[PDB]
């Protein structure tokens, strides 16, 4: 028997401002459905406190997508609209099974592609330094596919316990805080200026796995998104 995330109070604020995409972007459950007890192996309350996401398959996802609160439609904001857009979370990333290589756990996306992904990564060298089993940010600064179109940053090695995140966007600049420590400050987003279709996402988005059956698994102890100003 799986317990629904909405059976406790902790995640109601974000569920009231989200729809769930599972197992792909085009297949979704509404905010009302989430608040109404949506549950399954892909999305359930683990150990009485974690909103847990599970997904297998290349580029499949089980992921919340920001909505206007209280039965509203899809949100679309701009990095330069003068408001501060903030997402917060507390995440336990457990050991990922063999075949899972990268799992995107928070994003800023838009109708013109992902501005930001925060992802767990099994192994990668960044700026000449090898990192393993860690959390990375990937920020798009161009629309090409080569790595020159991104800024990639090691944020933190994966921890045994819950890890907090805060993403702040204000006046075309991005700050990321992990476990209370600033890990990116003032990253320029002015390439996305004018793109009025941005929104937060969070959950599990499985990137470039080496097995199609390997199930990514991510646990949220907290998640919220807000505007201030
Ligand atoms: Na676990």
TrEMBL record:
What this protein is called in its record is Alginate lyase
Q: Where is the Alginate lyase domain?
A: 17-223
What the entry lists under InterPro entries is as follows: Alginate_lyase_2, ConA-like_dom_sf
State the Gene3D superfamilies in the record: 2.60.120.200
Q: Which gene encodes it?
A: PsAlg7C
Any idea which UniProt keywords this protein has? Answer: Lyase, Signal
> What GO MF annotations does this protein's record show?
lyase activity
């Amino acid at each position: 028997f799986l317990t629904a995330v909405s059976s406790i109070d902790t995640f109601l604020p974000v569920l009231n401002e989200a729809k769930l995409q599972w197992p792909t972007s085009a297949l979704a459950a509404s905010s009302e459905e989430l608040l109404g007890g949506y549950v399954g192996s892909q999305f359930y309350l683990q150990d009485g406190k974690y909103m847990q996401f599970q997904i297998a398959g290349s580029s499949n996802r089980c992921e919340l997508r920001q909505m206007i609160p209280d039965g509203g439609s899809e949100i679309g904001w701009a990095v330069d609209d003068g408001t501060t857009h903030t997402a917060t979370s507390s995440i336990v990333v457990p050991e990922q099974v063999d075949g899972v290589e990268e799992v995107t756990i928070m994003q800023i996306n838009s109708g013109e592609a992902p501005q930001l992904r925060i992802s767990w990564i099994r192994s990668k060298s960044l700026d000449g330094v090898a990192y393993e089993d860690f959390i990375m940010s990937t920020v798009r600064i161009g629309t090409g596919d080569s790595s020159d179109n991104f800024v990639k940053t090691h944020l933190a090695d994966r921890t045994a316990g819950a890890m907090s995140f805060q993403i702040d966007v204000k006046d075309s600049k991005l700050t990321i805080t992990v476990n209370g420590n600033v890990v990116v400050n003032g990253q320029d987003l002015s390439f996305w200026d004018g793109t009025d279709s941005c929104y937060f996402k969070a959950g599990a988005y499985n990137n470039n796995p080496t097995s199609e059956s390997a199930t990514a698994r991510i646990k949220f102890a907290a998640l919220a998104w807000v505007d201030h100003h």
